[PDB]
Amino acid sequence: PAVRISDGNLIIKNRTILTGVPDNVITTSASEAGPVEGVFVGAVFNKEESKHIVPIGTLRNSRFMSCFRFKLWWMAQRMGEMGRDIPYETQFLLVESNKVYTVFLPLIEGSFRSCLQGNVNDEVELCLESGDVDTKRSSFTHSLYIHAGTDPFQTITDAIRTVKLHLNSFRQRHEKKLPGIVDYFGWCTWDAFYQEVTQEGVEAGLKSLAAGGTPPKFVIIDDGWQSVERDASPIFRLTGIKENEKFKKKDDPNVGIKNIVKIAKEKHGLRYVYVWHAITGYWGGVRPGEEYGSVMKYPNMSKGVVENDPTWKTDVMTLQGLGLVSPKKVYKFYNELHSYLADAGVDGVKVAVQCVLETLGGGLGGRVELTRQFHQALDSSVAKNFPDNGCIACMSHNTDALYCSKQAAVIRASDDFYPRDPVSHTIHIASVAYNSVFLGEFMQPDWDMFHSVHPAAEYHASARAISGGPLYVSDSPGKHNFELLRKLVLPDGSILRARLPGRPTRDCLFADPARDGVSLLKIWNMNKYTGVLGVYNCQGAAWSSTERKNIFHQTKTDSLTGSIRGRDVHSISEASTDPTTWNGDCAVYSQSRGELIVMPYNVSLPVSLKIREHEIFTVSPISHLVDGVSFAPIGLVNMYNSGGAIEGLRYEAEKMKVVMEVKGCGKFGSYSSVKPKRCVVESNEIAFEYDSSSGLVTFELDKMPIENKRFHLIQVEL
Ligand SMILES: OC[C@H]1O[C@@](CO)(O[C@H]2O[C@H](CO)[C@@H](O)[C@H](O)[C@H]2O)[C@@H](O)[C@@H]1O
Numbered sequence: 001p002a003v004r005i006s007d008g009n010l011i012i013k014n015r016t017i018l019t020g021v022p023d024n025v026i027t028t029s030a031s032e033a034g035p036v037e038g039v040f041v042g043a044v045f046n047k048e049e050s051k052h053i054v055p056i057g058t059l060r061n062s063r064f065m066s067c068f069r070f071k072l073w074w075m076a077q078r079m080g081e082m083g084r085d086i087p088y089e090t091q092f093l094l095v096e097s098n099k100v101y102t103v104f105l106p107l108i109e110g111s112f113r114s115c116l117q118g119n120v121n122d123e124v125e126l127c128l129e130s131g132d133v134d135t136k137r138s139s140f141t142h143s144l145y146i147h148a149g150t151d152p153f154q155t156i157t158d159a160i161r162t163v164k165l166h167l168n169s170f171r172q173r174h175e176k177k178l179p180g181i182v183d184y185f186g187w188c189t190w191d192a193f194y195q196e197v198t199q200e201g202v203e204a205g206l207k208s209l210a211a212g213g214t215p216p217k218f219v220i221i222d223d224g225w226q227s228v229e230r231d232a233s234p235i236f237r238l239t240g241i242k243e244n245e246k247f248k249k250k251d252d253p254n255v256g257i258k259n260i261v262k263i264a265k266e267k268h269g270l271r272y273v274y275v276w277h278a279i280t281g282y283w284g285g286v287r288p289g290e291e292y293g294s295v296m297k298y299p300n301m302s303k304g305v306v307e308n309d310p311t312w313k314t315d316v317m318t319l320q321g322l323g324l325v326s327p328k329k330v331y332k333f334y335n336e337l338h339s340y341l342a343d344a345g346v347d348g349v350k351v352a353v354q355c356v357l358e359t360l361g362g363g364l365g366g367r368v369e370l371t372r373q374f375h376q377a378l379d380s381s382v383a384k385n386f387p388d389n390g391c392i393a394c395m396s397h398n399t400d401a402l403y404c405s406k407q408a409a410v411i412r413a414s415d416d417f418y419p420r421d422p423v424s425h426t427i428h429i430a431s432v433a434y435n436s437v438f439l440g441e442f443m444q445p446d447w448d449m450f451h452s453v454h455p456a457a458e459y460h461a462s463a464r465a466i467s468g469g470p471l472y473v474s475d476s477p478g479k480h481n482f483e484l485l486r487k488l489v490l491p492d493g494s495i496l497r498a499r500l501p502g503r504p505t506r507d508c509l510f511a512d513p514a515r516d517g518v519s520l521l522k523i524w525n526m527n528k529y530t531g532v533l534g535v536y537n538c539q540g541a542a543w544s545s546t547e548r549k550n551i552f553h554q555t556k557t558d559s560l561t562g563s564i565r566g567r568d569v570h571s572i573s574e575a576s577t578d579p580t581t582w583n584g585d586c587a588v589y590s591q592s593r594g595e596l597i598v599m600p601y602n603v604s605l606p607v608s609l610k611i612r613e614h615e616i617f618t619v620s621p622i623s624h625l626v627d628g629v630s631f632a633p634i635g636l637v638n639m640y641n642s643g644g645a646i647e648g649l650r651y652e653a654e655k656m657k658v659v660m661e662v663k664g665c666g667k668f669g670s671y672s673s674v675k676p677k678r679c680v681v682e683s684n685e686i687a688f689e690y691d692s693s694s695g696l697v698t699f700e701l702d703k704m705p706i707e708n709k710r711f712h713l714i715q716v717e718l
């Protein structure tokens with residue numbers, strides 16, 4: 001039966017994962033389709049309650065990785081071996097058995113949301129909450145799902161699909177439509193002006209970036225554009241749906257945000273303009289009033305949230321409350337805001353402050369209900385007014401929202417980029433990587449803005465390049481490092497986006513690279529015909545379980561040595577043109593060192609990194625045409641994600657020939673065991689270099705493709 005409870009014990013493929021599973025914990029594998037290869041778990045209690053804690057069993061001697069909410073809004077990672085180490089507000093738990101991997105997915109059921117938490121007895125407790133004292137229940141059958149497999153990533157996906165088939169209240173990442181912003185460079189106003197942003201600042205930032213050769217094709221006009229007011233350090237509330245004075249044209253005050261949209265798009269050649277709002281309008285909601293049925297509500301504190309983030313008790317939102325739009329009028333509110341924005345030429349919204357809803361369900365059916373109602377409405381309005389699916393979810397890491405994520409396709413995957421907080425950089429990289437393991441099953445991760453002139457610029461930039469997600473800076477105008485940005489952005493504003501959410505390697509899933517003092521974090525992704533691997537030292541800082549905030553902590557050495565293997569890129573097979581004959585050998589190109597190495601299957605290459613250093617590798621499967629004649633494309637070697645440039649690849653072994661289609665421009669690189677006879681671009685022979693010791697072939701792709709004809713056609717004649 002595979003996943004089962006027998007005697008006191010949760011058993012997984014003849015391995016005991018939990019002991020002492022109490023009698024009131026019930027399981028079922030029945031479904032709709034029907035017998036399912038894991039188990040839905042619930043329990044029955046004596047009493048009808050709005051909150052229940054129940055032990056699932058005792059976990060000891062089993063390595064795990066967890067994503068837990070360290071703030072209301074956001075998750076980070078914790079590893080361990082003992083149930084006592086499972087944080088409060090654990091929303092995703094992955095367990096390794098010495099090789100089998102078990103996922104634990106705490107779910108929404110009816111009006112209740114679940115999470116996992118550890119106790120001092122090493123039990124894994126299921127915490128069920130409605131978020132409303134009037135919404136009570138005594139039994140549950142589907143509040144947790146457990147599934148096991150031999151591939152850790154496949155095991156997660158398969159369990160999410162099974163959860164999907166049960167709830168039907170969300171779709172998986174790959175089943176949704178990505179907005180077009182994800183293929184272009186962008187700029188966000190946030191760190192440039194904070195709330196002081198003006199239409200003139202927006203223009204100046206766009207102008208300065210395009211001036212250096214790296215033109216953004218989207219912009220996010222961040223927080224500061226909306227009409228907001230304090231009540232008659234006081235919180236601001238939304239007072240109208242239209243822009244404030246800073247975005248009304250300088251002479252004709254009846255033309256509003258449309259002014260800056262036209263300047264962006266018509267004067268500066270941007271494709272997309274997005275704007276920020278809170279899911280409640282502004283931070284203090286909407287000013288009470290009848291138009292949107294807005295009434296003062298005060299955040300309710302839940303124990304697990306406040307245990308991990310005590311400052312949420314005395315947050316400005318908690319003490320001064322929000323004007324919460326009525327459920328009756330929430331569609332009207334979003335439609336009227338969004339119809340105004342779209343008629344002005346706005347293409348999308350970055351919708352922040354998402355999780356507050358879970359704290360405001362008191363009159364209203366609870367956290368799950370209110371969350372669902374507000375997202376149903378938001379989704380109707382976005383699909384109406386922003387039909388490229390122009391929505392970026394922000395501050396949204398609760399399961400209440402994830403399990404109703406039926407449409408939006410991009411999610412901010414960590415706490416904000418913090419230009420002035422030295423502790424935040426290593427932690428940002430670890431958080432985005434680990435969170436993406438789980439968040440990426442729902443939506444494409446967004447690894448946030450960053451600064452091109454900053455001591456950790458390269459660290460952040462290189463991570464964004466391998467993220468799979470949107471690539472955007474928040475530079476103040478004129479504060480740019482164009483040498484860095486050319487590595488990310490082509491002259492037409494396009495980028496070399498990888499295909500998956502960037503994630504830790506199998507190797508790294510259970511070793512905490514922020515806390516263990518021992519390991520390098522390795523992040524893998526895929527292009528069509530290469531893999532890519534980023535390696536990061538992010539030791540020395542993490543969220544402290546004692547101080548309940550991010551701090552520095554002691555590390556044994558400055559420098560650490562780990563190692564790299566082709567097969568660290570978990571799906572590398574899929575880049576091979578002939579994966580049934582491939583022996584697993586890869587060409588491996590270090591983008592910073594400019595070094596090409598051939599790595600046979602399983603051979604390890606040492607990598608040594610000090611804290612806050614990184615290295616990026618393009619990993620390309622070698623094709624063996626005939627004995628002595630081997631090849632692998634690398635791509636645009638002066639860009640971080642070099643392999644992202646390769647759109648087509650055909651080997652013609654009977655002609656000793658390679659045929660590629662390559663986007664972009666700049667220097668193109670490939671591995672060849674032999675010096676080519678001719679490299680031909682667009683039906684003309686060109687000059688090339690060949691290093692005969694490494695096999696590195698090199699030639700220039702001069703200009704972006706003439707037209708419209710979006711790819712360079714390249715033939716390499718061996
Ligand atoms: O700026 C206050 C506003 O930001 C949030 C998170 O977006 O809180 C951050 O700033 C607070 C004020 O100094 C801190 O107490 C808090 O821990 C930090 O996350 C919102 O909570 C808040 O309304």
Ligand SMILES: OC[C@@H]1O[C@@H](O)[C@@H](O)[C@@H](O)[C@H]1O
Pocket residue numbers: 190222223276352394395416
């Ligand atoms: O008020 C500013 C905003 O809210 C944040 O916490 C964050 O996600 C920023 O990227 C941002 O737009």
